[PDB]
Amino acid sequence: KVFMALANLLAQPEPIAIGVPGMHQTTPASQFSHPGVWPPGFLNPQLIN
Amino acid sequence: KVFMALANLLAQPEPIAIGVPGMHQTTPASQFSHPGVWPPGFLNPQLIN
Amino acid sequence: NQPLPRLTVAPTYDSAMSNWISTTIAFFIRVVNSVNMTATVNDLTRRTM
Amino acid sequence: NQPLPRLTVAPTYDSAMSNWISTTIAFFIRVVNSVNMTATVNDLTRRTM
């Protein structure tokens, strides 16, 4: 959630990949409460270019 | 009618082709009142990955 | 146009229109910082525009 | 954690909390001095931030 707050704050200049369909980067950060919907860029920073 | 009740609520998370013609997955589940409209994915679960 | 989105929708910038909105805004910025507007309009108010 | 000290205590900066504090602050300094942040906000107010 802490990571999500910033990633949804600047989702225009820096697009990342949210791991599931059903939510996007501009989804409200409070919804990131399941373990499966952690973004893969956050689980491994080498995926973010 | 029990099976298609979950298939209606999962038309957008987990979509699957319903092989009986004229009846899609978003058909209401209280309308499958004939044996000819029994979906082939329900008669054989191996048709669903 | 794309067909109806399967799952919950949040504002996305990859839509064909947003990009049109984005390039034009991006293009004007370069008008604001061009060699014409640099000389005449003040620099402290050019950052606001 | 560390064991309880019996000496006169003073605020330190080599704890894991004071390291976490002084890295998110050092990150948001890098945020506020980015390229997509220096475009819109004035150059005087980011000196205050």
GROMACS .gro file of C-alpha atoms in nm, chain B residues 5-49:
model
   45
   54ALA     CA    1  -2.535  -1.919  -1.133
   55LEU     CA    2  -2.161  -1.907  -1.075
   56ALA     CA    3  -2.093  -1.882  -1.448
   57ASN     CA    4  -2.296  -1.561  -1.465
   58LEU     CA    5  -2.098  -1.405  -1.181
   59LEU     CA    6  -1.772  -1.506  -1.350
   60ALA     CA    7  -1.842  -1.385  -1.702
   61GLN     CA    8  -1.565  -1.126  -1.671
   62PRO     CA    9  -1.307  -1.280  -1.430
   63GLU     CA   10  -1.301  -1.624  -1.590
   64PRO     CA   11  -1.478  -1.632  -1.927
   65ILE     CA   12  -1.543  -1.959  -2.106
   66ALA     CA   13  -1.732  -2.036  -2.427
   67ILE     CA   14  -2.072  -2.198  -2.373
   68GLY     CA   15  -2.103  -2.433  -2.668
   69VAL     CA   16  -2.483  -2.447  -2.692
   70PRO     CA   17  -2.583  -2.200  -2.965
   71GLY     CA   18  -2.786  -1.892  -2.882
   72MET     CA   19  -2.704  -1.905  -2.508
   73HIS     CA   20  -2.392  -1.723  -2.392
   74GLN     CA   21  -2.232  -1.712  -2.050
   75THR     CA   22  -2.428  -1.399  -1.959
   76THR     CA   23  -2.758  -1.579  -2.011
   77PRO     CA   24  -2.957  -1.573  -1.684
   78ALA     CA   25  -2.912  -1.898  -1.497
   79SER     CA   26  -3.283  -1.935  -1.426
   80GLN     CA   27  -3.346  -2.001  -1.795
   81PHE     CA   28  -3.163  -2.330  -1.856
   82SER     CA   29  -3.476  -2.538  -1.816
   83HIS     CA   30  -3.416  -2.801  -2.087
   84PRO     CA   31  -3.162  -3.084  -2.125
   85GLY     CA   32  -3.064  -2.965  -2.471
   86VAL     CA   33  -2.930  -2.642  -2.322
   87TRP     CA   34  -2.697  -2.821  -2.083
   88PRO     CA   35  -2.354  -2.674  -2.163
   89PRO     CA   36  -2.083  -2.911  -2.287
   90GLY     CA   37  -1.836  -2.762  -2.041
   91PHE     CA   38  -2.076  -2.873  -1.769
   92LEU     CA   39  -2.124  -3.223  -1.911
   93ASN     CA   40  -1.746  -3.263  -1.934
   94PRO     CA   41  -1.521  -3.046  -1.714
   95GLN     CA   42  -1.217  -3.125  -1.932
   96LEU     CA   43  -1.342  -2.865  -2.182
   97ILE     CA   44  -1.248  -2.593  -1.931
   98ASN     CA   45  -0.878  -2.525  -1.876
   0.00000   0.00000   0.00000
